[PDB]
Design a protein around this ligand. Structure first.
Ligand code: V2X
Length: 226
């Protein structure tokens, strides 16, 4: 469980980490709404790996939701080609992601899903797929995403260097692109109330996110609603 941990009670964030006790107030509030966390490896990939795992986990047993998600996934090869990705280059990453979608579709357990996401090779192929889809999404909407980058930076160069490569850290750009790309309603909770970084992924309670992530200093763990 080196890439995605077993569940820990939310208050482990305080009990195990003296360094977090300054965030006691936020964590104790979150503990009213969320019961548990899974920890993700801090390797530059944690957003993609957290969102992939958490969303597929959210689908287990929801056969209609799985069906509609499989349809979106079967369309992604065309989105990738429209963005200039050749099939022979994305095939193995598509196949890894398709495989874990079929695992969830065929009754699939949390245990079997965790095993794929803790397999370095399978998990990193899934992350690479999610990175290419993120890049494809941004490239296809250069006009929109152009607003959020460095004027001197080309959108294609941003994607080449800050989205496609493994271990490249996310900003709100990649979170927006991937969530829109797969229609994953995501909510990000912050550990640190004093962190001023604008949150583009917090909505009112009445919204129905699939995935809740817990953010601190470039790192995203998975949250479980109470
Ligand atoms: C989401 C994600 O993977 N976040 N990244 C981390 O937690 C990276 C920051 C930590 C790290 C890894 C290797 C080396 C250093 C100096 C930091």
């Amino acid at each position: 469980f080196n890439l995605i941990s077993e569940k820990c009670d939310i208050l482990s964030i305080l009990r195990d980490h003296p360094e977090n006790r300054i965030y006691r107030r936020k964590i104790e509030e979150l503990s009213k709404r969320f019961t548990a966390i899974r920890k993700t490896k801090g390797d530059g990939n944690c957003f993609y790996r957290a969102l992939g795992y958490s969303y597929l986990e959210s689908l287990l047993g929801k056969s209609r939701e799985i069906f509609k998600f499989k349809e979106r996934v079967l369309q992604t090869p065309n989105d990738l080609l429209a963005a200039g990705f050749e099939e022979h280059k994305f095939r193995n990453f598509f196949n890894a992601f398709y495989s874990v979608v079929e695992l969830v579709e065929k009754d699939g357990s949390v245990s079997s899903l965790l095993k794929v996401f803790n397999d370095q090779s399978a998990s990193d192929h899934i992350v690479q797929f999610l990175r290419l889809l993120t890049s494809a999404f941004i490239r296809n909407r250069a006009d929109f995403f152009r607003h959020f980058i460095d004027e001197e930076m080309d959108i294609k160069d941003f994607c080449t260097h800050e989205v496609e490569p493994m271990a490249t850290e996310c900003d709100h750009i990649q979170i927006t692109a991937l969530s829109q790309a797969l229609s994953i309603a995501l909510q990000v909770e912050y550990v640190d109330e004093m962190d001023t970084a604008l949150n583009h992924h917090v909505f009112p309670e009445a919204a129905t996110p699939s995935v809740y992530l817990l953010y601190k200093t470039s790192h995203y763990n998975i949250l479980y609603a109470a």
